[PDB]
Amino acid sequence: KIEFRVVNNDNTKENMMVLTGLKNIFQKQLPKMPKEYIARLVYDRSHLSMAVIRKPLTVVGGITYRPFDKREFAEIVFCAISSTEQVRGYGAHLMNHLKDYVRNTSNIKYFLTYADNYAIGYFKKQGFTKEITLDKSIWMGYIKDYEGGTLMQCSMLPRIRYLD
């Protein structure tokens, strides 16, 4: 009943529908952030989004991230589970699925995020740490921190699946 789907703005209606439902969750959960800024990032084609979907197409949460495949890391820009979908497990399963996805479809081995105060606890639970060990030369300039959050890092294992 619950699907974890990766989408991005490739000009298709179904993808836009998911991106929009996700954007609305982020906008509601991060009200102090400029809503148009959130929209721009989610709809940016370079940004991918893993959405938690309940059939038919009900977005219950998700993560919008910016992968830098060549540098082996991705910035987790937005993360949230709908406040009306407080069923235990969604947040953890969403992160678990994203880790499995990037490890099997890319050369991404690290996650970096400027966590908002209220997300720090969740991220720690997902194995992220405030102790940044990824050299600044790798990510500096590639990720921004306009909200003054807390940089956190997750270091994952090397790529699994590879065909093309």
All domains of the chain, ordered by start, with CATH?
Answer: 1-164 (3.40.630.30)
CA distance 93 to 64: 15
**87 is an annotated ligand-binding site residue:** yes
Strand arrangement of the beta sheet that strand 110-115 belongs to: 2-7, 48-54, 58-68, 73-81, 110-115, 150-155
CA-to-CA dists, residue 123 to 13, 58, 111, angstroms: 32, 24, 11
| Count of H-run helices and E-run strands, the chain | 5, 6
Contacts for 99-103: CB closer than 8 Å, 24+ residues apart? 99/154, 99/156, 101/4, 101/6, 101/50, 102/67, 102/74, 102/156, 103/156, 103/157, 103/158, 103/159, 103/160
**61 is an annotated ligand-binding site residue:** no
CA distance 90 to 82: 10
Residues whose CB falls within 8 Å of the CB of residue 23, separated by 6 or more in sequence, listed in order: 38, 39, 42, 43
CA distance 67 to 69: 6
The token duo for 18 is: 């998911």
Asked if residues 41 and 64 have their Cβ atoms less than 8 Å apart, the reply is: yes
Catalytic residue among 75, 85, 131, 147: 75
CA distance 64 to 149: 16
CA-to-CA dists, residue 17 to 32, 41, 55, 61, angstroms: 24, 15, 13, 13
Residue 75 annotated in active site: yes
**118 is an annotated ligand-binding site residue:** yes
CA distance 97 to 146: 28
What is the SS3 assignment for 153?
strand
What is the SS3 assignment for 150?
strand
Tracing tokens 């910016």 back to the chain, one arrives at 66
**90 is an annotated ligand-binding site residue:** yes
The approach used to solve this structure was X-ray
**80 is an annotated ligand-binding site residue:** yes
Smallest CA-to-CA distance from 21 within 58, 54, 55 is with 58
The residues that bridge with 110 in the sheet, in sequence order, are: 73, 155
Residues whose CB falls within 8 Å of the CB of residue 124, separated by 6 or more in sequence, listed in order: 152
CA distance 115 to 150: 5
Looking at the chain, which runs of residues are DSSP E strands?
A: 2-7, 48-54, 58-68, 73-81, 110-115, 150-155
Smallest CA-to-CA distance from 113 within 101, 103, 100, 98 is with 98
Asked if residues 4 and 97 have their Cβ atoms less than 8 Å apart, the reply is: yes
**81 is an annotated ligand-binding site residue:** yes
Residues whose CB falls within 8 Å of the CB of residue 138, separated by 6 or more in sequence, listed in order: 71, 72, 73
Residues whose CB falls within 8 Å of the CB of residue 141, separated by 6 or more in sequence, listed in order: none
